């Protein structure tokens, strides 16, 4: 042994589940809401199902410039 | 007798905490419709 | 992009009258097309006769014209060769040949309209991919 | 608890069921409970299939494997395999499910409540694996049971409505078998047929008369064999050839089931008689032949002379010769010329495919069938997207023939592994070295060096 | 002892430099026949009409091949699954044109290799060993059966069996991918896990035992002279090896039981390769890899491609090109 | 003597559940971020702007199709740092530009260095020889040649492997179609090392388990071993005889056996890395010149080598327009190579 409390002791203890019957669901629900509120889309810049193309556009908004790439994506997003 | 917060505790939570968060996020994704 | 009423507006007849389909009719059209037609017409081609596809332009040049709801619904009741010269119910699924094509037995007039709508809307979405075959996959 | 840990049994938890080798009462419980699982599945799965069943859709479009087994027996279907009555499917499902409770009850009772060993309770039901006469007697009982089972198939076929006959003159239909094949030269002639192309061993059986008469023979052979084994004890040569232990007997059965699994794989893959294509979908060979037929018909309608049409390679585009000269479909399907099916045979003459019949006598029903089969070829992805690997999503299809062939190959293969595992172990255990080499009696140390 | 009794004693003798045995009685002639035919064919066989379209493919060294391109070419598609022994041909010239050597070789090889597996049980029994080495060998054996027998049966032709050559092997793989999307099949993925993992664990075990060898030699001599064949004492320190690997990851992730460790070393690659064999044996009946072609669709219904669709484009390239003169009708159904 | 360095050294090297060490300062953050970056990207991040692909669970991909995809070809070999001149500190744009790819690749690279340092550190402290670290040079040679050297010789990171299951499959098929990588003798040695390694793993494990001495009464034989026992748990003499009689040769030296187990897969991976270094420059084993001269002059000459080039030609033409969207390839139907019918 290295000193730390055995995992088996911990996960069978009442105090563990008192704490984790709260922390586990809370984190799960936080994750759920990260998606359900749509915040995940805006944080990472991931298109929603309705934002891949403009209505009549059938050309992919590919980045073609290295140093004006950021502005290109911005320009693409304006065109939506 | 046993310590509560350890290096092991941190390592466990660096993995456990985002994992559960991510699983809730992916659970929610299963109801998204185009 | 969205599946708008404009996308869902297709020719009803040879005169120029249009019909606007609901999203529910679109879903039903895809479901029913898969149910009764896709085994041969997946992606708007024709597996057992690749010369003839379900592109709107091809349908328009059919006899009688099939680039509208009426033409397509009629095709599903009494299918003909591309020139209108021969009735092919005996070798093509139709209401008229529901006895030998049993999947046609439970297709209502409403169902036929949905399938017809699917055939017309799909290329408006997918463009040349519809009726294109593997080249466009 | 007796023998229910590693220290007392010698077996770890993961080999827990080996603790049952010499506990006949609990082991009987294990078996009866297991049989309850098999019967449970047959019942519950049937009901599931029926609940999901759309009668006007082909069965093979619906992921069904059990209803096709019921239909093949002549229950619930009419001409062309059309479903006329789903109630027989319901009966089979319900009765199996009901029966599974009874077996479950017996299994659970014997496993955890009844006598742990049967030997002190009953001389009849108790047994020692090393008792060769008792072993052959139980074997004899089961052989009789199996022989009766085979005769039940005969009974259905001959006296209780018949079986579905894909070959029935005028088109596929349920048919009562009045004249089963009893001629031992025909029945046992199948057994001596090469397993290779154009022959196909027992998988070649192509008419119900041979199927029924085969089961008459098997029914009587099993009963006679069972009686024989109740009344005799293994001969000297048999005693010296075999290992006599529970694990040895398990291993022989494992090898047997592996063999059977492999045979069933080829049966469902190639045979369209006892697996009618009306219910199971076309065979791989069939669908490929049907594509050639489809385009022959199409192109001939367009004006093509299909007999004289030279393909790119110089072989006939539609029609060519087999290596023995028979007229056969061209293209890659040249490999499938051994195929025989009711939609195709009308075009076949003594020389193979008959050009006159091809030009003049192809009926719309043949065209329909060829088109149906060409577009229901047994190709599809694991997530049930029909067609070649490159197909786009749309058609939800994997043929029952593929499901049945693959599953049984996997099962047959692992059962061969199991045979080797248990046969090897049984040999080692009987000889007394299954637990390792005796450090003080290491056999190699008493042998001369090889060099 | 009579003639038979002495013969039996010789056959089963534990003192033969190479064990013969009863499986050996079948193994020896079949492997010799397969080997001799293979060598002659690889050197000297004329071109073979693999696809039955009178387009003979040259496989042998004397007919313009090297080691990498050379093959014993599969038998003609015209034959299918028909048994094509020498005596079924009008002449050796015909037999060769149609790829008779392939069938002779694979049938003799598969029988001999099955007997090789049986022989491994057999000797283990004669030596008082435990019996399961042969079970480990069933993994590669099953894989040989998959590519030489099961796949041809499923597809209806020995022309689709794997060629006996280096480039012919790659041909088999590329076409297999086109037709079954094997990369997207979980049994092949398990197979990769088995072989990648088997290599990993091989390097792992090799490194850990070597790391903990007990000092028995001087600086100037090879440490291998520190172990003597048949010594009773173990040659490395497993407690030290465990003490290392348990600290590399964590204690309970490392083995301290050598028997359990070696079981794992046996089981990981063997089970994985079983699944690989089963991949090929079940794709033999066209239950193919996962198909996610056009699985992701936007609000309007535009297909949004994934890496699956890019795989599809590669597969289409293989599909349209393979056996370029063999197909007359739009679907490749076997 | 007992200054802050020595005190820090004490704490780093404490015998705890997860050993840290000096190497842990490099290892743990880089490994955590590489893994975290992958999980983040595959869960939430698109490849729409770099590849025209969906690549995350959020977009509807599954475990097999998600990926952290490489940056667009126009990025060249930009390190693509968050604060760099492309993203300019904007986290969202950085994700859209494929910044997570270089993030994962680079943290992954320093992570592997930390892991191999960890292998050295632990071995020194426990007093074993560092053969495990040495064997790990093979995974390092592979990661470096494939994920760094290969794209660095090419036009951009775009052509590096993308971090995903299907994306890696795409990488395999690209290498077949463009590099004819199966024909490369360095890849062939790699295959021999991997399959040979797996063979050695299986055969050694099985041999030990089937030459065990009976050291207990249990029919389950695992409990009959003690870590501290002096004796070998299996018979090398019996193992040797078995193989000598079965295969013709057998190991007789246990130290050689185990070294050979290191050598085989380690050498194989090294060889495959050398091949990929060549492919970085399109320096392929693509052709056999003699085969081509013969085939060009003689339209009846065909081998499996010529058959495979036709497949490559199909792969290239059919996959290139979507796989290399920056090229704006438009191949009209008529130019596409196809055999008959298909
Ligand atoms: C006990 C120990 C045995 C040891 C002895 C070994 C030596 C002899 C065994 C030979 C091995 C089999 C090779 C032939 C395989 C084959 O082509 O078998 C296929 C045949 C079926 O043949 C087909 O049978 C067909 C019958 O259908 C015909 O008839 C039908 C009737 O409806 C239809 O009309 C149909 O259209 C029509 O064509 C046709 O004749 C086809 O041309 C013909 O190819 O199956 C069959 O005979 C059944 C045989 C199933 C065996 C499958 C092989 C599996 C073994 C590998 C296991 C892996 C090992 C792992 C090691 C670790
Ligand atoms: C061993 C194990 C150890 C463990 C591994 C440790 C991991 C540490 C991580 C280090 C990462 C290094 C990143 C290298 C980035 C790079 O190189 O990025 C590339 C740049 C060069 O930029 C490229 O330059 C190209 C050529 O441009 C030139 O030519 C153009 C056309 O004519 C124009 O004129 C242009 O203006 C002009 O600059 C293109 O522009 C490309 O788009 C652009 O990306 O070089 C540079 O930064 C630096 C170039 C010189 C230094 C190279 C040292 C390291 C690289 C060794 C690999 C060699 C690869 C050969 C392949 C075999
Ligand atoms: C009639 C068939 C049959 C019977 C009656 C037995 C019976 C026995 N075997 Mg044998 N075996 C068989 C077939 C059979 N086996 C096959 C086909 C194989 C090849 C794989 C084996 C390989 C085998 C080995 C290696 C061993 C045995 C052993 C044993 C004994 C203990 C079994 C036990 O406790 O397992 C307990 C059961 C488990 C631990 C669970 C196994 C889980 C499997 C691997 C997963 C199955 C996949 C499933 C379909 C999917 C899971 C769904 C999931 C999502 C929930 C017992 C005498 C042991 C022995 O030799 O005793 C003397 C032993 O070591 N068997
Ligand atoms: C087909 C599956 C199957 C069957 C039929 C059996 C059968 C049996 N096992 Mg094996 N076993 C299996 C799989 C199976 N096993 C697997 C997968 C493993 C690995 C996890 C094992 C590991 C194992 C070990 C280690 C042991 C057994 C033992 C036993 C026997 C006694 C069990 C006992 O003492 O219960 C005790 C448990 C209970 C009393 C709890 C209730 C159990 C009941 C039976 C549940 C039934 C529920 C059911 C839904 C009710 C329906 C009733 C309805 C019809 C009215 C019993 C005959 C023991 C033995 O050999 O005895 C000497 C033993 O030691 N098994
Ligand atoms: C003979 C076996 C067998 C066969 C051929 C089929 C075939 C079929 N089934 Mg049935 N079924 C079975 C047994 C079988 N099933 C069992 C055991 C159950 C209980 C769970 C069911 C319950 C069931 C349901 C609820 C449904 C089906 C459905 C279907 C259809 C689609 C299947 C599918 O999509 O799979 C997807 C493929 C997989 C899930 C992969 C299976 C992977 C397994 C675990 C690998 C096994 C390997 C080996 C045994 C492991 C051993 C390890 C070794 C090392 C020891 C198809 C016709 C569907 C249908 O269409 O109904 C109308 C459907 O809804 N089946
Ligand atoms: C093959 C499986 C099998 C076998 C060999 C046995 C054998 C035994 N059982 Mg068990 N049991 C079983 C399954 C089995 N049972 C099932 C399915 C159930 C649920 C009904 C039970 C419930 C049960 C109980 C409650 C008891 C036993 C008892 C006994 C013992 C004495 C029985 C006797 O003397 O009957 C003499 C013969 C008869 C009474 C006539 C038999 C009538 C049968 C059912 C006619 C049909 C036969 C036909 C072949 C079955 C086809 C079914 C098939 C399709 C599956 C004996 C050890 C007793 C015990 O162990 O004592 C302590 C006991 O109390 N059994
Ligand atoms: C489950 C079915 C079953 C089982 C397990 C047994 C078991 C046994 N029987 Mg019995 N038998 C059965 C059914 C069965 N029998 C039936 C239905 C009949 C009626 C015909 C008989 C009539 C019978 C007789 C007359 C005798 C036995 C004998 C025996 C014993 C040794 C037999 C032997 O060595 O076979 C292995 C076979 C051989 C050693 C012969 C040569 C093997 C060749 C190579 C087989 C060729 C086939 C090959 C595998 C491939 C070809 C494919 C094939 C499917 C065509 C053994 C206890 C003997 C005994 O001792 O009686 C008390 C004996 O004399 N049985
Ligand atoms: C040991 C752990 C470690 C290592 C080796 C790295 C290494 C790397 N990181 Mg990662 N990172 C880490 C931990 C680590 N990181 C942690 C804990 C976090 C959470 C905050 C991050 C979050 C992170 C992000 C968001 C990014 C990186 C990025 C990078 C890369 C560029 C770093 C750089 O250029 O800095 C340069 C700085 C140094 C080398 C330190 C200089 C120290 C010298 C010796 C002293 C001189 C400094 C002096 C005191 C200051 C005076 C300046 C004054 C004149 C203004 C490189 C692969 C980038 C990358 O991946 O892009 C693709 C990137 O975008 N990291
Ligand atoms: C020994 C053992 C075991 C085993 C067990 C077993 C295997 C069993 C069983 C069992 C069973 C085998 C059972 C059963 C059952 C059943 C039931 C309970 C039933 C029923 C039914 C019903 C109720 C029905 C109904 C209906 C109808 C009538 C009609 C229609 C609809 C419905 C479906 C609703 C185990 C592993 C745990 C382990 C330990 C020991
Ligand atoms: C990027 C970045 C960062 C970071 C981050 C991180 C660090 C993260 C993380 C993360 C994480 C850490 C996550 C997670 C996760 C997870 C998951 C999502 C999971 C899962 C799972 C599963 C689902 C499972 C399953 C399975 C398996 C595997 C096996 C067998 C069976 C089963 C089926 C159970 C920073 C800010 C610095 C900055 C910039 C960028
Ligand atoms: C983290 C970087 C490691 C560089 C090590 C340089 C140590 S520096 C060294 O440290 C001693 C105490 O540790 C002091 O007593 C001494 O004054 C100081 O020079
Ligand atoms: Cl090819
Ligand atoms: Cl064809
Ligand atoms: Fe070892």
Summarize the structure.
This is part of a larger assembly, with chains A (80 residues), B (34 residues), C (137 residues), D (451 residues), E (334 residues) and F (342 residues). Chain A is mainly alpha-helical. Chain A is built from four helices and no strands.
Structure, described:
Chain A is an all-alpha fold and 80 residues long. The longest helix of chain A is centred in the N-terminal third of the chain and has 23 residues, at 14-36. Chain A has a single domain (1-80), classed as Photosystem II cytochrome b559, alpha subunit (Single alpha-helices involved in coiled-coils or other helix-helix interfaces). Chain A has helices at residues 7-11, 14-36, 39-44, 69-78. Chain B is an all-alpha fold and 34 residues long. Chain B contains one helix and no strands. In chain B, 18% of the residues are buried. Chain D has helices at residues 6-9, 24-52, 67-72, 87-112, 132-159, 184-187, 208-231, 236-241, 246-270, 277-280, 284-301, 355-360, 364-374, 400-431, and strands at 163-165, 173-175, 319-321, 327-329, 348-349, 352-353, 380-381. Chain D has 451 residues and is mainly alpha-helical. In chain D, strand 3 and strand 4 form a beta hairpin. Chain F has 342 residues and is an all-alpha fold. Helix content of chain F is 57%, strand content 1%. Chain F has a two-stranded antiparallel ribbon with strand order 1-2. In chain F, helix 4 (99-126) packs antiparallel against helix 5 (131-153), helix 5 packs parallel to helix 9 and helix 6 packs across helix 11 (304-323). Chain F is globular. The chains are: A mainly alpha (80), B mainly alpha (34), C mainly alpha (137), D mainly alpha (451), E mainly alpha (334), F mainly alpha (342). Chains E and F meet through helix 4, helix 5, helix 6, helix 7 and helix 8 of E and helix 4, helix 5, helix 6, helix 7 and helix 8 of F. Strand 7 of chain D pairs parallel with strand 3 of chain E, so a sheet runs across the interface. The structure holds digalactosyl diacyl glycerol (dgdg) (2 copies), chlorophyll A (6 copies), beta-carotene (BCR) (2 copies), heptyl 1-thio-beta-D-glucopyranoside (HTG), chloride ion (CL) (2 copies) and fe (ii) ion. Chain C: GO terms for molecular function: electron transfer activity; heme binding; iron ion binding. Chain C: Belongs to the cytochrome c family. PsbV subfamily. Chain C: Keywords: Electron transport, Heme, Iron, Membrane, Metal-binding, Photosynthesis, Photosystem II, Signal, Thylakoid, Transport.
List keywords for this structure.
6 chains; A: 80 residues; mainly alpha; 4 helices; C: mainly alpha; two-stranded antiparallel sheet; 5 helices; 4% strand; globular; binds chlorophyll A; binds beta-carotene; binds heptyl 1-thio-beta-D-glucopyranoside; thylakoid (chain B); electron transport (chain B); membrane (chain B); metal-binding (chain B)
Topology:
This is part of a larger assembly, with chains A (80 residues), B (34 residues), C (137 residues), D (451 residues), E (334 residues) and F (342 residues).
Chain A: H1 7-11, H2 14-36, H3 39-44, H4 69-78
Chain D: H1 6-9, H2 24-52, H3 67-72, H4 87-112, H5 132-159, E1 163-165, E2 173-175, H6 184-187, H7 208-231, H8 236-241, H9 246-270, H10 277-280, H11 284-301, E3 319-321, E4 327-329, E5 348-349, E6 352-353, H12 355-360, H13 364-374, E7 380-381, H14 400-431
Antiparallel strand pairs in D: 1-2, 3-4, 5-6
Chain E: H1 3-11, H2 21-44, E1 71-72, H3 92-97, H4 100-126, H5 133-155, E2 164-165, H6 166-180, H7 186-211, H8 238-248, H9 258-283, E3 287-288, H10 307-321
Antiparallel strand pairs in E: 1-2
Helix pairs in contact in E: 2-4, 4-5, 5-9, 6-10, 7-9
The complex binds digalactosyl diacyl glycerol (dgdg) (2 copies), chlorophyll A (6 copies), beta-carotene (2 copies), heptyl 1-thio-beta-D-glucopyranoside, chloride ion (2 copies) and fe (ii) ion.
The site of one chloride ion (CL) has 4 residues of chain E, from helix 6.
PDB class: electron transport
Keywords: Photosystem II, Electron transfer, Light-Driven Water Oxidation, Membrane-Protein Complex, Oxygen Evolution, Oxygen-Evolving Complex, Proton-Coupled Electron Transfer, Photosynthesis, Reaction Centre, Sr-Substituted Photosystem II, Substrate Water molecule, Trans-Membrane Alpha Helix, electron transport
Entry title: Structure of Sr-substituted photosystem II
């Amino acid at each position: 042994t290295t000193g730390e409390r055995p995992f088996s002791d911990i996960i069978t203890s009442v105090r563990y589940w008192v704490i984790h019957s709260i922390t586990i669901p809370a984190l799960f629900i936080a994750g759920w809401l990260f998606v359900s509120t749509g915040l995940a889309y805006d944080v990472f810049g991931t298109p929603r199902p309705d934002s891949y193309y403009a209505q009549e556009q059938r050309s992919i908004p590919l980045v073609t410039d290295r140093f004006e790439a950021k502005q290109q994506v911005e320009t693409f997003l304006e065109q939506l | 007798s046993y310590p509560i917060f350890t290096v092991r505790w941190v390592a466990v939570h660096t993995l456990a905490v985002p994992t559960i968060f991510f699983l809730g996020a992916i659970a929610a994704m299963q109801f998204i419709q185009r | 992009a969205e599946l708008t009423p404009e996308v869902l507006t297709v020719p009803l007849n040879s005169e120029g009258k249009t019909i606007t389909l609901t999203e529910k009719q679109y879903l039903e059209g895809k479901r029913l097309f898969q149910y009764a037609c896709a085994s041969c017409h997946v992606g708007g081609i024709t597996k057992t006769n690749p010369s003839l596809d379900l592109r709107t332009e091809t349908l328009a040049l059919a006899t009688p014209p099939r680039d509208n709801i009426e033409g397509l619904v009629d095709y599903m009741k009494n299918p003909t060769t591309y020139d209108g010269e021969q009735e092919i119910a005996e070798v093509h699924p139709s209401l008229r040949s529901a006895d030998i094509f049993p999947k046609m037995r439970n297709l209502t007039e409403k169902d036929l309209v949905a399938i017809a709508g699917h055939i017309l809307v799909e290329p408006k979405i997918l463009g040349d991919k519809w009726g294109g075959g593997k080249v466009y996959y | 608890a007796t023998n229910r840990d590693q220290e007392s049994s010698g077996f770890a938890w993961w080999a827990g069921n080996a603790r049952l080798i010499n506990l006949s009462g609990k082991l009987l419980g294990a078996h009866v409970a297991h049989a309850g699982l098999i019967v449970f599945w047959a019942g519950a799965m049937t009901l599931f299939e029926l609940a999901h069943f759309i009668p006007e859709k082909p069965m093979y479009e619906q992921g069904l494997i059990l209803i096709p087994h019921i239909a093949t027996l002549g229950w619930g279907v009419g001409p062309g395999g059309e479903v006329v009555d789903t109630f027989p499917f319901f009966v089979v499902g319900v009765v199996h499910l009901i029966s599974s409770a009874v077996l479950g009850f017996g299994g659970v009772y014997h496993a955890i409540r009844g006598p742990e060993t049967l030997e002190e309770y009953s001389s009849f039901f108790g047994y020692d694996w090393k008792d060769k006469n008792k072993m052959t007697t139980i074997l004899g009982f089961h052989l009789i049971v199996l022989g009766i089972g085979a005769l039940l198939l005969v009974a259905k076929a001959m006296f209780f409505g018949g079986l579905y006959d894909t070959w029935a003159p005028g088109g596929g239909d349920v048919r009562v078998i009045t004249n089963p094949t009893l001629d031992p030269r025909v029945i046992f002639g199948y057994l001596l047929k090469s397993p290779f192309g154009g022959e196909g061993w027992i998988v070649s059986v192509n008419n119900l008369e041979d199927v029924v008469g085969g089961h008459i023979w098997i029914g009587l052979i099993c009963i006679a064999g069972g009686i024989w084994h109740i009344l005799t004890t293994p001969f000297g040569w048999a005693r010296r050839a075999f290992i006599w232990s529970g694990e040895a007997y398990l291993s022989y059965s494992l090898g047997a089931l592996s063999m059977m699994g492999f045979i069933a794989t080829c049966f469902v893959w190639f045979n369209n008689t006892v697996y009618p294509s009306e219910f199971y979908g076309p065979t791989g060979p069939e669908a490929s032949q049907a594509q050639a037929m489809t385009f022959l018909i199409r192109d001939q309608k367009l004006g093509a002379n299909v007999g004289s049409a030279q393909g790119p390679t110089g072989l006939g585009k539609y029609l060519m010769r087999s290596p023995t000269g028979e007229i056969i479909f061209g293209g890659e399907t040249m490999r499938f010329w051994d195929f025989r099916g009711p939609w195709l045979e009308p075009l076949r003459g003594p020389n193979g495919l008959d050009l006159n019949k091809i030009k003049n006598d192809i009926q719309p029903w043949q065209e329909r069938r060829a088109a149906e089969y060409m577009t229901h070829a047994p190709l599809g992805s694991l997530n049930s997207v029909g067609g070649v690997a490159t197909e786009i999503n749309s058609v939800n299809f994997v043929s029952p023939r593929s499901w049945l062939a693959t599953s049984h190959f996997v099962l047959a293969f692992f059962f061969l592994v199991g045979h080797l595992w248990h046969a090897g172990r049984a040999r080692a255990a009987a000889a007394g070295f299954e637990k390792g080499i005796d450090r003080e009696s290491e056999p190699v140390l008493s042998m001369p060096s090889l060099d | 002892a009579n003639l038979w009794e002495r013969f039996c004693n010789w056959v089963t003798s534990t003192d033969n430099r190479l064990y013969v045995g009863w499986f050996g009685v079948i193994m020896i002639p079949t492997l010799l026949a397969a080997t001799i035919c293979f060598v002659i064919a690889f050197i000297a066989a004329p071109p073979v009409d693999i696809d039955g379209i009178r387009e003979p493919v040259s496989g042998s060294l004397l007919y313009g091949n090297n080691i990498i391109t050379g093959a014993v070419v599969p038998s003609s598609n015209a034959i299918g699954l028909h048994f094509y022994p020498i005596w079924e041909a009008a002449s050796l010239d015909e037999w060769l044109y149609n790829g008779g050597p392939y069938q002779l070789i694979i049938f003799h090889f598969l029988l001999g290799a099955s007997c090789y597996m049986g022989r491994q049980w057999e000797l283990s029994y004669r030596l008082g060993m435990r019996p399961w080495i042969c079970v480990a060998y069933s993994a590669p054996l099953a894989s040989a059966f998959a590519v030489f027998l099961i796949y041809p049966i499923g597809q209806g032709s020995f022309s689709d069996g794997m060629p006996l050559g280096i480039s012919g092997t790659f041909n088999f793989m590329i076409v297999f991918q086109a037709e079954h999307n094997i990369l997207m099949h979980p049994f092949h993925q398990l197979g990769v896990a088995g072989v990648f993992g088997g290599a990993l664990f091989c390097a792992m075990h090799g490194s850990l035992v070597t790391s903990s060898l007990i000092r028995e030699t001087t600086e100037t001599e090879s440490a291998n002279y520190g172990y003597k064949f048949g010594q009773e004492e173990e040659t490395y320190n497993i407690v030290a090896a465990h003490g290392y690997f348990g600290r590399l990851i964590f204690q309970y992730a490392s083995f301290n039981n050598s028997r359990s460790l070696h079981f794992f070393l046996a089981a990981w690659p063997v089970v994985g390769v079983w699944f690989a064999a089963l991949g090929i044996s079940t794709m033999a009946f066209n239950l193919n890899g996962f198909n996610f072609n056009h699985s992701v669709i936007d609000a309007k219904g535009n297909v949004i491609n994934t890496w699956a669709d890019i795989i599809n484009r590669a597969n289409l390239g293989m599909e349209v090109m393979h056996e370029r003169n063999a197909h007359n009708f739009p679907l490749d159904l076997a | 003597e007992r200054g802050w360095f020595d005190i820090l050294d004490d704490w780093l090297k404490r015998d705890r559940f997860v050993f840290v060490g000096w190497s842990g300062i490099l290892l743990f953050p880089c490994a955590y971020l590489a893994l975290g970056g992958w999980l983040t990207g595959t869960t939430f991040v698109t490849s729409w702007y770099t590849h025209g692909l969906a690549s995350s669970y959020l977009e509807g991909c599954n475990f097999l199709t998600v990926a952290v995809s490489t940056p667009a070809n126009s990025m060249g070999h930009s390190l693509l740092l968050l604060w760099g001149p492309e993203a300019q500190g904007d986290f969202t744009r950085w994700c859209q530009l494929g910044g997570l790819w270089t993030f994962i690749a680079l943290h992954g690279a320093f992570g592997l260095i930390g892991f191999m340092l960890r292998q050295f550190e632990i071995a020194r402290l426990v007093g074993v020889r560092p053969y495990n670290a040495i064997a790990f040079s093979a995974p390092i040679a592979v990661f470096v040649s494939v994920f760094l050297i290969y794209p660095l010789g090419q036009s951009s990171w775009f052509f590096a492997p993308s971090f995903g299951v299907a994306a890696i499959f795409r990488f395999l098929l690209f290498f077949q179609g463009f590099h004819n990588w199966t024909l490369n003798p360095f890849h062939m040695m790699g295959v021999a090392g991997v399959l040979g390694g797996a063979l050695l793993c299986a055969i050694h494990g099985a041999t030990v388990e089937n030459t065990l001495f009976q050291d207990g009464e249990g029919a389950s034989t695992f409990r009959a071993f003690n870590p501290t026992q002096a004796e070998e748990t299996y018979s090398m003499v019996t193992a040797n005889r078995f193989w000598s009689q079965i295969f013709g040769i057998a190991f007789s030296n246990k130290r050689w056996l185990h070294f050979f187990m290191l050598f085989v897969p380690v050498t194989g991976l090294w060889m495959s890395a050398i091949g990929v270094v060549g492919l970085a420059l399109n320096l392929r084993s693509y052709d056999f010149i003699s085969q081509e001269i013969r085939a060009a002059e003689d339209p009846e000459f065909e081998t499996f080598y010529t058959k495979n080039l036709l497949l490559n030609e199909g792969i290239r033409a059919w996959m290139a327009p979507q796989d290399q969207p920056h090229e704006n390839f438009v191949f009209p139907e008529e130019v596409l190579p196809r055999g008959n019918a298909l």
